[PDB]
Design a protein around this ligand. Structure first.
Ligand code: HEM
Ligand code: HEM
Lengths: 145, 145
């Protein structure tokens, strides 16, 4: 359950999420676009869900892709800001899941974002410890799908 | 059309938006719920779009309503952060409009949020000067609906 998954966010996991977000969230446009372009590069099968975005290979030059990428980063900002209160984190995650459930995005499908997150983290000198912390946060969302 | 509306965001307007957001955005849960519940209080008919939230009369205690209210504030955070780059502001506004267009929310309907914003600003001692600046930001979104 989402309530059980949220309880897995221990003290050090929360701390590692904040420390890495301080850097990653500093450039939402740049890191947001890097995150999603990596998703399409490593998992081309997911491109089908983004027909509305057009030619995603254009990257930053694609206004729709840039708009989506910047916006995605504010969902992550929301999650990080709610780490202090489990009740608020859960209600924001459930709210976030609504549209993804309607698009038939499964937990397994959503989990494909872990790879891209690990790579972006590594590009900023944040290793496995941080990738694992982020996988824990992603797992809270997966529990809601 | 959206670019034209964005042109109304003059230097002075952006300054008032940033200055008032420094306060309003410091308590996203509190002010987001105040904003949302005021919308329902002044325009009861808007509740028709929120059947999924359940018993909205519960206010803050309603987890779904609270989740939506907090999340709403990050869309505004996004807009405020993109004020200095029209190209980015426009793409984030158009991205934001997609789901609202699908919900058949007209520009006129969306404009009903102006009253609630004026009241929330006033509760923090921000006068008409600030309410007018916010109405101009809302107008950018209206141009995309
Ligand atoms: C860290 C992970 C992710 C975050 C933070 C995220 C965030 C968002 C946000 C904020 C929106 C806009 C609001 C909405 O329409 O729900 C959105 C839209 C969307 N997301 Fe997610 N998402 C993530 C991963 C994914 C994945 C892995 C898929 C599918 C494989 C997915 C598919 C979609 C689609 C198709 C849209 C609509 C795009 C459009 O037409 O503009 N998302 N997502
Ligand atoms: C400045 C004001 C507003 C902001 C910043 C805002 C923001 C948001 C955000 C970020 C979402 C989640 C993503 C999505 O599904 O699109 C959302 C959902 C929604 N918004 Fe807007 N919105 C605003 C005003 C309105 C108004 C005036 C209406 C209708 C009278 C409206 C109706 C909806 C509905 C029905 C949902 C889905 C709620 C749910 O089932 O969870 N929004 N809005």
């Amino acid at each position: 359950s989402v309530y059980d998954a949220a309880a897995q966010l221990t003290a050090d996991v929360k701390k590692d999420l904040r420390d890495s977000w301080k850097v990653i969230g500093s450039d939402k446009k740049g890191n947001g676009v890097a995150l999603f372009t990596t998703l399409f590069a490593d998992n081309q099968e997911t491109i089908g869900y983004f027909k509305r975005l057009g030619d995603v290979s254009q990257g930053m030059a694609n206004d729709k892709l840039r708009g989506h990428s910047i916006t995605l980063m504010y969902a992550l900002q929301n999650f990080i800001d709610q780490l202090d209160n489990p009740d608020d984190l859960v209600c924001v995650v459930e709210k976030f899941a609504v549209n993804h459930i309607t698009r038939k995005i499964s937990a397994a499908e959503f989990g494909k974002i872990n790879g891209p997150i690990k790579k972006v983290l590594a590009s900023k000198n944040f290793g496995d410890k941080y990738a694992n912390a982020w996988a824990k946060l992603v797992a809270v969302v997966q529990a809601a799908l």
